[PDB]
Amino acid sequence: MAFTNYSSLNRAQLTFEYLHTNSTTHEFLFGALAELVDNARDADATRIDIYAERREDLRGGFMLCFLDDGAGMDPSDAASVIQFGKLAKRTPESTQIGQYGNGLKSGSMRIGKDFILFTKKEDTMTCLFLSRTFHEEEGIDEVIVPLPTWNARTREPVTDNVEKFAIETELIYKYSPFRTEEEVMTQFMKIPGDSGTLVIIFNLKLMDNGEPELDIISNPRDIQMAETSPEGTKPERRSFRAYAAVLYIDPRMRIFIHGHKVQTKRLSCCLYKPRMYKYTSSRFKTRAEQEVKKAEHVARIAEEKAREAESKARTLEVRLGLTRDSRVMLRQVQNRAITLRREADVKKRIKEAKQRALKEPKELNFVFGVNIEHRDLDGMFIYNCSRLIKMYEKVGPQLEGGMACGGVVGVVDVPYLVLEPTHNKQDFADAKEYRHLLRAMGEHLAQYWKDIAIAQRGIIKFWDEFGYLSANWNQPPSSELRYKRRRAMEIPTTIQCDLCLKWRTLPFYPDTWVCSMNPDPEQDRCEASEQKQKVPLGTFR
Amino acid sequence: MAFTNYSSLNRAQLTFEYLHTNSTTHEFLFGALAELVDNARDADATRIDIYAERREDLRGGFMLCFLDDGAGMDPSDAASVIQFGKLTQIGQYGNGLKSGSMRIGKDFILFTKKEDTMTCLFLSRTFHEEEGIDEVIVPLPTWNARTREPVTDNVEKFAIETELIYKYSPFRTEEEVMTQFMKIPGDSGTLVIIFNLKLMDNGEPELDIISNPRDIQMAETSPEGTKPERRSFRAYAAVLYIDPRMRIFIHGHKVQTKRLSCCLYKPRMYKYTSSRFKTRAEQEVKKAEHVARIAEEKAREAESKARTLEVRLGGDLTRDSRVMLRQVQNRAITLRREADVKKRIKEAKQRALKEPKELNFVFGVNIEHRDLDGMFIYNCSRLIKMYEKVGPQLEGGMACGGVVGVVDVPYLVLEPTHNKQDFADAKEYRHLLRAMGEHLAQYWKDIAIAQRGIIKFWDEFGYLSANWNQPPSSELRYKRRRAMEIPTTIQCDLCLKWRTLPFDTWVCSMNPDPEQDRCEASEQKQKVPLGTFR
Ligand SMILES: Nc1ncnc2c1ncn2[C@@H]1O[C@H](COP(=O)(O)OP(=O)(O)OP(=O)(O)O)[C@@H](O)[C@H]1O
Ligand SMILES: Nc1ncnc2c1ncn2[C@@H]1O[C@H](COP(=O)(O)OP(=O)(O)OP(=O)(O)O)[C@@H](O)[C@H]1O
Ligand SMILES: [Mg+2]
Ligand SMILES: [Mg+2]
Ligand SMILES: [Mg+2]
Ligand SMILES: [Zn+2]
Ligand SMILES: [Zn+2]
């Protein structure tokens, strides 16, 4: 639906140095790794393994590997990986984390110089190779990407251009970690199901002392930041095991680091006296109303177009009363009426669906609870379409010098209609609306504090009871048995089944666990339905 | 240096939606505007005008215009604007104009002039949306600056480009477009016009140009720890560069740009030896010396082959022998001049290595506005972080309250994030903040505000109120007590030099100091006294 032909006009293009520019969005390095985790989750993976493969010959001494059992990609899906940005016409997927068409490129190029991706779907498997080493060595200022595909059952090349295929694979054997077709096939065989994806980042960034930024040696079950950790340093900012555990508000996909299961968690299940407050969001309501007004305008224009075409069809029949050209013209009008009518009806259905959703409550659910195990790890955790964006954000009374609201963790999941993330997915694009949300969360936090009445009974004695002997607000509570049990009694023990993925409670560095290991006879089989945490409801003004 | 032919291989491409993705880097809206100001400064502009043009037919009701008298762009410079990624300039990422403009508005049109050309670059998301275009297609017509004839190798392309501009831009005819080019009055300069500005949910633009007609303010209520630089573009623009030269005007009214170190009580400078600075300079040298080493071995082999072939050919001198001898001899000549040029770069890096590898921390007391304190961190002169609390300021206390710190960090030590509002290397940035905090404690000991002591210090400058946030008294005796402590620095509107006065538009000849009394008098540098750490 364009006016002329634009084939001679200038196109904006990506140059090699833009790969670096894009990567500078990630000052928080774990946020780069999170992009690749998000992609596995969006592909409906039930499991992602993040692990190191030692390679003394590559910068940093290892390759960082992300292996998922998700849906994988066919060859055209794989070619769209290097499209920066997505397609505006794409069918809307409101619940996918991926919307910007950029995360894998920004994140991978923060972490290392090069990456190679292997993916399989149905009867194809495709390699995508992004080698900044190649571009530097050969003076390439474009961004050129080998993208060979093989048949997954026979291993024959699938290519319309055998010369292109030869050049692509030769680049891979020259510059990648894998020097032969056999070595490449070995990587494809690490995806053991019918589908999945393996992303390998290599030639990792080094600090000035020549050591990698990512330390996989100090704790061989973890990926840690290679930096000293001061007094108020949050575990999620130094330990990827800790960060990955809270990356999603509703974890289902299982996460393993170096082969060792991460205990993912629902933050609201780890806190003392969790309570939920429903916040009526005027922004949520106004934006839903605008999305409706737009759908109803789009259905309105399509209906007038269908109504005119049907009217013309009828009138043209009367006017024609019946020659050979006239016949053709009559069915071109009659069918055009038919197709506009079905177009108008489909847009009317979308309008109606948005109208139905408009009547649903336009609320954000703020959940608060007291972090009795780690009183200094407090503040708000703000998720956006289930993905963690801000952590440990102080609001309300926590912004004062005081013990008021000290220890309180808040959690909220914000839909895209209310806020969208910044380019690095570590902040919100609409700062004005985000600051509004934080003030609203602060007012509800104050109410939560009144509601649990810690101060009625008295705030210092509350903390004494859980074993905070020390006068320094940041030391952990006592580890002696009486205080451990006092704290543990308040926090249910939850665990995820490795087979069916349901979340279970037990009645008083995890290994394999399945439902039939539970001594509770009501949850002791994978077929037993999942029980929901019933977080009690509080009320505010 | 390409091995085989790569023309059939896939290229990464930019799609229309990427323009939006890229723009989401700017959560701080003024940091999007700063990208365009940075581009004028880098183009050696002596002036930028940022102003609104009312247009009730366009979204937000006005267009935001950036007009500079810098070096402008020839047609190939203009075309490289849409080559994403690029290259003591601020500009290094090849992105800022695109990320910033697309944060502010849906569309932009840029007009630029250099020598005998003038070029229009039109980025219309309206066009792409209306016509379902998923690539990023950019009209780029050029005219001759003197005759106004099109300069184009393809008149059909030129007709389509201009028709797009007349259809989708604010300017519907060639005459209207020429009127914009005529707003660039010198031989060179650039006019960037952002339009169809983003709206808030209430239908109003994010940028408020009404409340103060001499400013561009954020259209949001300001709580009262809210820093002026985060709601007033006039405030932000004044401190955007550590060494302002370019004059900045908003809606025709001059911004009083300033050097923060000149606005503070008892400024002192501490030299901080940076091991990061030294290690990175040493690595940049090791690299240059490897590059010159390889080139020299290549030149030495080629020269040796040239000499040996001369003695081997001896007296022969057939035509065939002569020509092939010169081929070898000239090849030696070229490699030798290549090797010599790399040896010169190596030497230059070696010389720079011996310069001190220091960051200069400057601290002073903000006696006019005690609550506007903390560190201002500049990166190659460009403000990155403001009001960052360090050292004793991170406690509850009056210790180091009111102290502003300033440091300019070279690219070798830190580079900025994608939005130029943070530092890409968080580990080294945190290290820098700790170092600044330690020096801040020393500065506090050094000015000995406890010899006075601290409450009596503040009450002498008129902080009568008990609340730390309220301004000091406005009564005349306290105004003069504060002003007496801050020397007066002022920029000449004609020659752009910075002057100190011994005491709107101002010029050098208005200075009563006989040594700085003429635009031709040499510029005097800040003499900040030096303190020492431990
Ligand atoms: N592990 C994976 N499994 C399946 N598909 C993947 C995987 N990783 C990437 N992709 C595909 O590659 C595309 C590009 O990924 P990328 O992260 O760059 O952008 P995105 O996920 O669409 O958006 P965002 O920028 O918001 O992350 C995805 O849209 C998806 O189609
Ligand atoms: N006002 C201007 N005057 C002259 N040249 C300009 C102007 N604005 C932009 N340019 C040119 O357009 C190019 C692209 O600008 P852009 O801001 O996108 O990237 P950059 O300044 O190279 O790097 P950065 O992304 O760090 O800002 C610049 O390199 C410069 O050559
Ligand atoms: Mg993604
Ligand atoms: Mg699968
Ligand atoms: Mg720029
Ligand atoms: Zn189960
Ligand atoms: Zn002068």
Residue numbers in the entry:
A (entry chain B): 1 to 321, 324 to 510, 519 to 551
B (entry chain A): 1 to 87, 95 to 510, 521 to 551
What does the literature reporting this entry say, word for word?
MORC2 is a 1032-amino acid protein predicted to contain several functional domains including an N-terminal GHKL-type ATPase module with a coiled-coil insertion (CC1). Here we report the biochemical and cellular activities of MORC2 variants, alongside structures of wild-type and neuropathic variant forms of a MORC2 fragment comprising the GHKL-type ATPase module and CW domain.
Its sidechain hydroxyl forms a hydrogen bond with the β-phosphate of AMPPNP in the wild-type structure. In the S87L mutant, we found that the lid is partially missing in one protomer and has a completely different conformation in the other. Leu87 itself forms apolar contacts with Asp141 from the other protomer, but more importantly, Arg90 forms a tight salt bridge with Glu17 across protomers.
